[PDB]
Structure formats: C-alpha cells, structure tokens
Amino acid sequence: FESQSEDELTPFDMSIQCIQSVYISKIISSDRDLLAVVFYGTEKDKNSVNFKNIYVLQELDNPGAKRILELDQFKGQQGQKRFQDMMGHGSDYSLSEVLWVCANLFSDVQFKMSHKRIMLFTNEDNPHGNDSAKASRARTKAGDLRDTGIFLDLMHLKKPGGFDISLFYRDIISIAEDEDLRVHFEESSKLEDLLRKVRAKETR
C-alpha cells in the first residue's frame, strides 16, 4: 500500500485493476470460465476449512458485473481505506495455508476443468525469511500442487529495493522462463498483457 514516487499506482491498486481487466476480458471472450479472488495476510478470515489470515473474497464462479463492482469498491484511495477497514492489513501468514485454501477452492467446483491456474500478486521476494520451517512447508505444498496438475505463476510488483526470484520463488513457479533468474527492478511484463483488454469472442 506504499507508493515509491507518490504518483504511480500502488501495487494493491494495480493488482485490483489487473483483476478487473481480466474479468472484463473474460466476460466477452468466454462466459463459461471460472474466476476466484482470495486475499492472504488479512486480519479477518473466511474459508470452508477455516484457516487463519486467509480471506476468500470471491469463490470460483462465472464472471459477472457484481464481482467487477465488488472489486471496484477497492479501486482507489477511498477504496484502499475501505478495504483496510473491512479486512485489515499487516499480519503474519504462512504460504502453505494459502496454497491449501486454493486447492480446496479448485476441488470444490464440479465442472470439468481444462486448466487450473493460480496467480500470485506480491512484492515480497523472501516472505519467510526469519523462519525456515514455513519455507519448507511452502516448497512441499508447491510441489504437491505442481504434481496435482495446477500451474502457479507470480506477477512480481514494484519493490523499492529490488525483486529477486532466486531467493524463494525460483522453485515455486511451474515453469521458469529462459531469462528470469536476474533481479527485476521493474514490474512484471505480464502486467501489461493482463491490462490489455481484449474484446472478442473466441470459440474452442
């Protein structure tokens, strides 16, 4: 929730905008796709199996205008304040619980899934730095998810110092790109693709 230059978009607002753009693109390209929004690191929690600090804002369901408006309610500074008031921020978390919640959400749906994808919007290269057991649990959960058939991808956001994937996220992503082991001083190039709205229906 901090802006480095005081004029550029904050990571949270940019992530919300990307999610909204993806929702709008899906509303036209494919109406029979499932999208979900889950927040981790919040004070409140709501899940089927009820872990801590994991909030499932929206389950896996077809995109709609109501979800877009719900996301829009957190659009800007007033939206950020409302999000902090209703949900909270700045709490400890463990990635294993988040990944297991995502797996439970995937398993909840009954329609046959052609693809199962997870998007990680964060700007923390080393979340579990002080701890080590939590990191190992995260690696084990990521490996279990990869073996299950779930593809996880990270959209690293602005980092005041610098974002490095070789610390913890090197073994977390499904497939590593040809040149992705360097330090990224700028936001992921995939953000531009996500924000590029596509208004066209494509049939399988």
Binding site: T140, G143, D144, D147
Partner: protein
Amino acid sequence: PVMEELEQGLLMQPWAWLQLAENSLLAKVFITKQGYALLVSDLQQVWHEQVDTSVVSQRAKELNKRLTAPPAAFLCHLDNLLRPLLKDAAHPSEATFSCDCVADALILRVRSELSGLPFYWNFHCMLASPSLVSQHLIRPLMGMSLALQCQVRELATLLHMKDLEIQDYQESGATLIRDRLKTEPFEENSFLEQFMIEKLPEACSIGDGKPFVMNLQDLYMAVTTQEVQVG
C-alpha cells in the same frame, strides 16, 4: 630482518584483481613503514618488486617533486590508496592505473589525488624469480587441489552413508509418499563421467583470473599459512 617481515607479509596476503586502463592483473601487495613488497601477474608472466625506505624516498622525490614527505608517510598513503581497491572493486577510487611492459620488466603507474593534489607512484616490477613464483603460485595451488580432492572424497563417503540409510529405510517396510523426492543411487564413476563431459569445459575456464580470486582465496590463504607454519 625488515626484508624478512616484508616477505612473510607478502606471502600471507591473498591475491586481488586489478583492472587497469585496458587489461587486468592479479596482485598482492604488503606495505609497512619500512618499505613494501609487490607481486603482479597476468596468468602468463609474474613480476616482483621489493623496496626499502631509502628507495621509496628517492622514487617519491624523483617522480613527484615539490613534495617533502618522509618515506613512512608516503608508504602509509600508498597503502591507503591501494588496499581499498584490492579488498573491493567497482567502487569510488579516483586512482588511475596503467601498465607498460618494457623489455624484460614492467612499470605499473598509479595516479591519485591526495587531498585534491596530484600524487604519482611507479612500481618497477622485474620478472619474478622461479623460487618466489613457485612458492607463491605452484605449491599453494597443488595443496588446494589436494584439499579439494579430499573434500570430494569425504562428500562421496557421506553420500554413500546416506544411501545406506535410505536403503535401510526402504527395506524397513516403508513406502515413499512423495515419489518426486526420489534420489537415485550415487556412483562415483558415473558422476565423474557425467561431470567431465557436461561441466568441465565451463568449470575449468580461468579466464582473466577473476574466478580464482572470487572463489579459491580462503583455501589459498589457509594452504599458504599451513606451508609457512610447516616451514
């Protein structure tokens, strides 16, 4: 005795990488109030120099005239100028370095600004003697290689013990849960055969000597210290 202390200090010091105007060198310098000793190389030839207070004063007077400094102060300033560069590179230096390879000799010119004023020095390094070159490069390198071979053997024995423990676990009515976390048996011959054809071409490239200083300096220092203690 002062020369002996200078030689011992030079032997103790580790190699450092120096980036001149165009080329690169591996250098070891030991400076004391009684003089200094320097050894430079470029992986093809080795030059050595060693000077005492009188030579330092004469050279300072003849190079940078209008400066009236005792040899101790000049040596201290030279150390202050050089040591930071050798310890770390790619940092604010403001100290130009150049080399001239005259017939059977080398001249290393260093230029700096001492409190905003010019400060020039020249190292007249002649070809290093075979004895010093051997003692400083060959024997320490052989010792390092032998130590690394011993380390490899120890790691292989540890891997064999771990494989035995894994075999015991498997045979004790066990069933691995995560099939992906399945390490194959370790064979020394197979590992060496794979390595020599997969990684040796890229792992044996000294280049300009940067990997040697960046990787094998602690072992080099330990081997040199052990050799000095032995004799």
